[PDB]
Design a protein around this ligand. Structure first.
Ligand SMILES: CCCCCCCCCC(=O)O
Ligand SMILES: CCCCCCCCCC(=O)O
Lengths: 150, 150
């Protein structure tokens, strides 16, 4: 994965996000509701010290609320977990594209509102032309308003 | 779905095909190995009377061989089953794009050889820009040579 947000302002990505689309390099990373990289983002909480708290949801027969922290690195756009989180692109107000790397790649197109942003899905597809994705999912506005996008 | 192969020669699509990519309007149509529209095409056998026998595989804990017939209609590119099969495009020698319609849409990019044809995946993505797909899958060359793409 050869794409990062130059000049990322991590502060400016705080608050509410929607997992509108997901892609991964193996079907099994996303295929089931229980699939390991099937995580829904609720909110991004950047610490004062420039780390990133992630509020998400994960189905494990329960939609479970889950709080994790991604530690800063020397590169503004890359963070470590427990496995790396890369930020590709964000306009801060509407969309944010990110990938998680073990290679067992998974990327999402986050958006601010429970709507289908065709502009943001274009960029996300463009950012994935380069990657070896074998499963892509997207969620309708109804499903975006529910726990675990049921 | 507003795209059909004008001037389809059904005879010329006979024989060996690979289900390289799949897309559907709901995740549940493709998400599991047991998902209803998760069918792998083996061979296409057009009858003398212009019908289409489909040899496929479907996982139901067994990869099961399955023989079905799609009856001709007034339109060369549309066939009925038991639910319609539409043929979008084929160059006969390398690729064939088709959709199945109940609307619960599912489409595949079939290819002749167990290889990743980037040209055919482009056309297939172009034919799906128009459709309300929420799950896309693709299979590597190894998986194409196995029962049920395991
Ligand atoms: C910059 C936004 C990153 C979103 C982070 C999602 C990471 C989930 C990790 C996990 O699978 O437990
Ligand atoms: C023209 C090629 C069409 C392929 C047909 C695949 C239909 C499978 C129907 C079913 O789900 O049982």
């Amino acid at each position: 994965v050869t794409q990062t947000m130059k000049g990322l302002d991590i502060q400016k990505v705080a608050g509410t996000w929607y997992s509108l689309a997901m892609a991964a390099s193996d079907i099994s990373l996303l295929d089931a509701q229980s699939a390991p990289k099937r995580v829904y983002v609720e909110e991004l909480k950047p610490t004062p010290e420039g780390d990133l708290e992630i509020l998400l949801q994960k189905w494990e027969g329960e939609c479970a609320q889950k709080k994790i922290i991604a530690e800063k690195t020397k590169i503004p756009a890359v963070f470590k977990i427990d496995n790396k989180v890369l930020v590709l692109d964000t306009d801060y107000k509407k969309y944010l594209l990110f990938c998680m790397e073990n290679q067992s790649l998974a990327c999402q197109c986050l958006v601010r509102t429970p709507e289908v942003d065709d502009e943001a899905l274009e960029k996300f597809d463009k950012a994935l032309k380069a990657l070896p994705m074998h499963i892509r999912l997207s969620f309708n506005p109804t499903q975006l308003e529910e726990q675990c996008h049921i």
